Subunit: 452 residues, 2 copies
């Protein structure tokens, strides 16, 4: 099968996520065939640096034959059994046991899904059921943020703050509210980041008092907003959000679907930013994307609420899927026992953050260079001196991302934010290779900017 034949069949038969089908079919899809470590090969034999780890999820890198062996052996013994008929199976029990050891104290119970989107729907039903068991049936509104991403179910798209998702499906659904994101570069006016952190967090208080605290169930946030452009909030933000939630008896929910399983150098983003959520959602790096699996980690107080309520009429055919559970077990055992998470905290994370700032800080149309552990970003700007963004935010990002893609480097644009989230196993040498290619692409970018 040629590149041509794969493109024609893709065009004729496959509808892609978050894509304009007509424009993709006219352009021709890029066909990825093989992965190894931090590298991909396409159908034309291009070797590509995957600076996005599939979709911020291939945390141990490509080529784990041990994961394929764990999948094969589980699929041969018991490919599926359901967790609905008062039934369980070894793989889901062993994974649940291992996950309780790497999650913080008070996170003993896990509910399994197929995806981050399903984890978020589960978390919404759980937080509403929790407040019904407490005898507060009005306490149902969840608060999220503009430019937050919580997946693509009806519930997750509603809780997310992407207007472009709201406009497709009549979203958000009721009992959903949104506050502004803690994007210092745009909203931080004449304030330091730390001052801005407190102002941005107090938008949650303003929103709670406008709705009424007795109607507010939860505040939900990514510790770092991922799909929104790696928006790293100031150090003062999360402690103030937490204070506000505790003051108004609002559950605090971390969406750990990106940050989870080592991306920040801690096991979870909320540990890096110093807040204690009541629940958190995970997927992606839970299996390093080798198989679909998600989870909701339920803290003791919410777990006791759900259990005291009797039947929880929620769950998926493939909840606790044995093969997915065996793969997630191999992945979490590798992250811990091979020191991959520890390595992000004390070796590759500090190296990446230093080298990312050394590489990009000098460019005249780059600003707000930021990141932690192995997630990093910057913003393309029209005038750095005035902190002026390009108009039609996203047009210049597209141009830069296409230069990267043409030069066999995967880094993505969210608007005019450029983001990177490579495999956590990336070597220092591979960080320097990636940065040399990105640096040359940015010199091409600046020259092309001036040329128009």
């Amino acid at each position: 099968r040629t590149t041509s034949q794969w493109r024609e069949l893709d065009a004729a038969h496959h509808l892609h996520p978050f894509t304009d089908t007509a424009s993709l079919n006219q352009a021709g899809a890029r066909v990825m065939t093989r992965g190894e470590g931090v590298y991909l090969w396409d159908s034309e034999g291009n070797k590509i640096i995957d600076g996005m780890a599939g979709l911020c999820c291939v945390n141990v890198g490509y080529g784990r034959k041990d994961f394929a062996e764990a999948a094969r052996r589980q699929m041969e013994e018991l490919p599926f059994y359901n967790t609905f008929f008062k039934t369980t199976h070894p793989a889901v029990v062993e994974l649940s046991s291992l996950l309780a050891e790497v999650t913080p104290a008070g996170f003993d119970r896990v509910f399994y899904t197929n995806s981050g989107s399903e984890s978020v729907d589960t978390m919404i039903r759980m937080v509403r059921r929790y407040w019904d068991v407490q005898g507060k049936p009005e306490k149902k509104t969840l608060i999220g943020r503009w430019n937050g991403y919580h997946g693509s179910t009806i519930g997750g798209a509603s809780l997310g703050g992407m207007k472009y998702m709201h406009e497709q499906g009549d979203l958000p659904i009721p009992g959903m509210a949104h506050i502004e994101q803690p994007w210092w570069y745009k909203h931080g006016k004449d304030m330091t980041p730390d001052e801005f952190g407190v102002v941005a967090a107090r938008w949650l208080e303003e929103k709670i008092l406008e709705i009424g605290a007795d109607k507010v169930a939860a505040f939900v946030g990514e510790p770092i907003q991922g799909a929104g452009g790696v928006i790293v909030p100031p150090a003062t933000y999360w402690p103030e959000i937490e204070r506000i939630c505790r003051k108004y008896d609002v559950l605090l929910v971390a969406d750990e679907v990106i940050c989870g399983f080592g991306r920040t150098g801690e096991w979870f983003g909320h540990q890096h930013f110093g807040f204690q959520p009541d629940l958190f959602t995970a997927a992606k790096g839970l299996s390093s994307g080798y198989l679909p699996i998600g989870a909701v980690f339920v803290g003791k107080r919410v777990a006791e609420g759900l259990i005291a309520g009797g039947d929880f009429n929620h769950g998926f055919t493939y909840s606790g899927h044995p093969v997915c559970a065996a793969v997630a077990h191999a992945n979490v055992a590798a992250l811990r026992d091979e020191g991959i998470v520890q390595r992000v905290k004390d070796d590759i994370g500090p190296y990446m953050q230093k080298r990312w700032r050394e590489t990009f800080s000098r460019f005249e149309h780059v600003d707000d260079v930021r990141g932690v552990g192995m997630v990093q970003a910057f913003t393309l700007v029209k005038n750095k001196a005035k902190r002026e963004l390009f108009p039609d935010f996203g047009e210049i990002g597209t141009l830069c991302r296409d230069i990267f893609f043409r030069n066999n480097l995967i880094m993505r644009a969210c608007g005019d934010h450029i983001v990177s989230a490579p495999p956590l196993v990336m070597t220092r040498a591979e960080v320097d290779e990636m940065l040399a290619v990105a640096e040359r692409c940015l010199e091409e970018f600046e020259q092309t900017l001036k040329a128009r």
Copy 2:
């Protein structure tokens, strides 16, 4: 690693779908370890007949080493790449091509998910986006049925008609409405099933006219209601539903998550019942449950509408997952090339339906014996003569289901409906084994009914 230790760790750490955690933890979870053909083994070494094919999904049976090999090979070459960055990969392209050959003509385009629940959410967003592209932004209400099941996302639970799901989450969401289900035994009054089929279908028209047709986007149904108790509608129902949809310019959606990939002896339930939906949802049997994967099959009309609209701001990280796609490809290739679906239509389906009626018709507390292909059911009743159901629908079903489970037979109760959906590869001899155990369980059931007044 003992039964004991697995039960303690499950109790301490695992929250199960659709379960009362406190009551499960006190009872102890039954630990399933091994599967082969139609059989399971538990941690105590019980050999069990799986009359439910996992959860109506393990259509080719347990023990396909070829599927494990396809998974292993794909996971070694390219375990994951996303379909978001103007990117694709061979496994999803090959699966999409094979799926177009086994779907009806005019279903060329497939959107991939991880689950039937995500397929249903995708279908809701697609139906609403379609009507926006047509310039009809109020055409947004989807109609389902009481006792319909459309999964467990907020969207799917809303569209489904399980009040026990609606009461947890403040559901349904807006633009969801429900009509009564075509359950002849309960609602069919003085009528033949065929007459009742027309009346039950016309409840859709009455509901469309009550809401206003310009506000109605779609009618969605399972060809056979699965989780609701294998409610098999009369032959007249689906053609009338389709007429009503066409009359009022309402999209017709089949939820094929159970019926799909051969359960009825056709590839899809809507083919057996003789209706042409505009879209249908699939999962379960798509991979025979060997890996999580769902899909929405989009007909030409809706595909043209979605494509004319430009960006579809919808999809999942694991949409088109390569390993799941390679396994789904092996499963659909086996269903077609090994004659498994054809064998349901021609051989095992007719045998099961005949033997199911022969076995269960004689019992004084069994009525409405029904089924098609390899899905079958009956209803436990208080008084057969008067067609009276037990009060507290579900209590007598629980008793019967527990007798089955205690006798190493998995058949489920939905309320007082007993349901069976075994692997499609079940032999005639395995059908007779399953029915002999179920028949003895029903004699025990009747005796303990009478004993306990």
